[PDB]
Amino acid sequence: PDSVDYRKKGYVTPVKNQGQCGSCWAFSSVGALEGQLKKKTGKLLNLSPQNLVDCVSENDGCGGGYMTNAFQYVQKNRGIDSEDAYPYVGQEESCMYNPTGKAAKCRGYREIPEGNEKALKRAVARVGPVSVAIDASLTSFQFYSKGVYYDESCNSDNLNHAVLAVGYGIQKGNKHWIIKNSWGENWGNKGYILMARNKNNACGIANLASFPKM
Ligand SMILES: *[C@](=O)([C]([C][C][C][C])[N]C(=O)O[C]([C]C1=NN=C(C2=[C][C]=C(C(F)(F)F)[C]=[C]2)O1)C([C])([C])[C])C(=O)[N]N1[C][C]OC1=O
């Protein structure tokens, strides 16, 4: 069955709203972690993006960052706090990681071969929700609400926004990826957007994908 929806499997936490802070990579990172945590312990809980924003020295907090740097941070740190133990405030602050708030661990990360949607698909099915980067600068993207998103003008080399691939499927002859955003439930469709799958790596959905080894 060429389709899977981790939201129905209970691997995806409610949709979050990151505000203006450039923490998309943090929500994307916790997103993937929340999925592997659910898979391993059968427990579904919100992880702390604020933990990453203030602690991942390789990234730039509200200035932007890479998900792989984030996963690496949790691995070396041997842990990441839950959302409730280290609440999101929308601004970079000093690193306040607390071991008693440790909700999950991480053992490293794997990166899907660049631009290989076929591989990306395999990873989503085999491992679970995958962290991915895309060009989210278009107005068509930001005004998405229904259907399968596909805009030619999307620049697969202009990766600038981080999101989460929680699955994939097909709608009326248009294959797609089920993508979790971090702009609240009022954006897109209950917070999600279906992005063109197999339509020439649209928006570069497969140029920078990865998940945490748990
Ligand atoms: C995002 O889309 C974030 C914030 C963008 C603010 C520049 N985008 C993002 O992280 O993109 C990264 C690639 C990236 N872009 N900038 C950087 C970066 C900048 C500076 C440094 C440092 F100073 F450390 F050298 C390092 C890295 O990395 C990626 C494509 C890989 C996800 C977002 O949060 N969007 N926003 C902002 C406000 O509301 C939003 O939705």
Side-chain angles (χ1 to χ4, degrees), residues 1-42 44-106 108-214:
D2 188 38
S3 198
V4 72
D5 193 329
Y6 289 104
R7 296 175 301 184
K8 313 251 183 185
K9 289 183 60 59
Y11 291 25
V12 192
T13 70
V15 171
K16 307 296 190 306
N17 194 317
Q18 67 169 79
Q20 198 57 41
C21 175
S23 52
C24 55
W25 57 270
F27 285 84
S28 179
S29 291
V30 294
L33 289 159
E34 297 171 334
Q36 293 301 302
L37 175 62
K38 160 62 178 177
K39 187 171 184 180
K40 180 177 182 178
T41 72
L44 179 65
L45 55 79
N46 304 300
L47 291 180
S48 167
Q50 190 67 50
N51 192 163
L52 305 172
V53 169
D54 310 341
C55 303
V56 178
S57 62
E58 284 300 295
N59 291 339
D60 195 41
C62 288
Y66 294 93
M67 291 84 94
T68 51
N69 291 350
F71 295 143
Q72 186 178 61
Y73 160 67
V74 174
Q75 177 248 304
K76 293 180 165 174
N77 188 55
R78 295 194 188 180
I80 181 173
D81 289 324
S82 64
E83 166 63 48
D84 292 314
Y86 199 154
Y88 183 67
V89 287
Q91 56 170 55
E92 202 186 325
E93 297 180 3
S94 68
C95 180
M96 291 297 280
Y97 174 76
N98 198 309
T100 63
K102 182 178 171 184
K105 219 177 176 184
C106 177
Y109 65 71
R110 268 197 189 179
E111 289 179 296
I112 288 66
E114 187 177 57
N116 194 315
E117 292 192 74
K118 181 134 179 163
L120 172 56
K121 177 185 158 182
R122 287 204 299 280
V124 176
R126 179 170 136 178
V127 182
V130 173
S131 289
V132 302
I134 60 176
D135 178 356
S137 69
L138 296 181
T139 292
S140 51
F141 175 94
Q142 297 173 50
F143 274 85
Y144 170 84
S145 68
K146 184 178 177 185
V148 179
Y149 185 72
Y150 176 65
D151 184 324
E152 206 68 50
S153 60
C154 228
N155 190 320
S156 73
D157 291 305
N158 188 203
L159 302 171
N160 50 56
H161 189 55
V163 293
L164 184 67
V166 305
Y168 65 84
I170 168 171
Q171 162 187 152
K172 301 174 188 171
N174 293 172
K175 296 184 178 184
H176 64 260
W177 298 100
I178 304 175
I179 304 296
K180 182 184 198 186
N181 207 331
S182 48
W183 296 353
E185 302 181 3
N186 284 309
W187 174 81
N189 186 21
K190 292 186 176 179
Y192 298 84
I193 173 180
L194 308 170
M195 304 186 86
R197 173 155 64 79
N198 283 1
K199 305 286 176 176
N200 197 26
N201 184 36
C203 292
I205 190 109
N207 277 346
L208 197 65
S210 74
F211 59 77
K213 301 160 61 187
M214 197 181 277

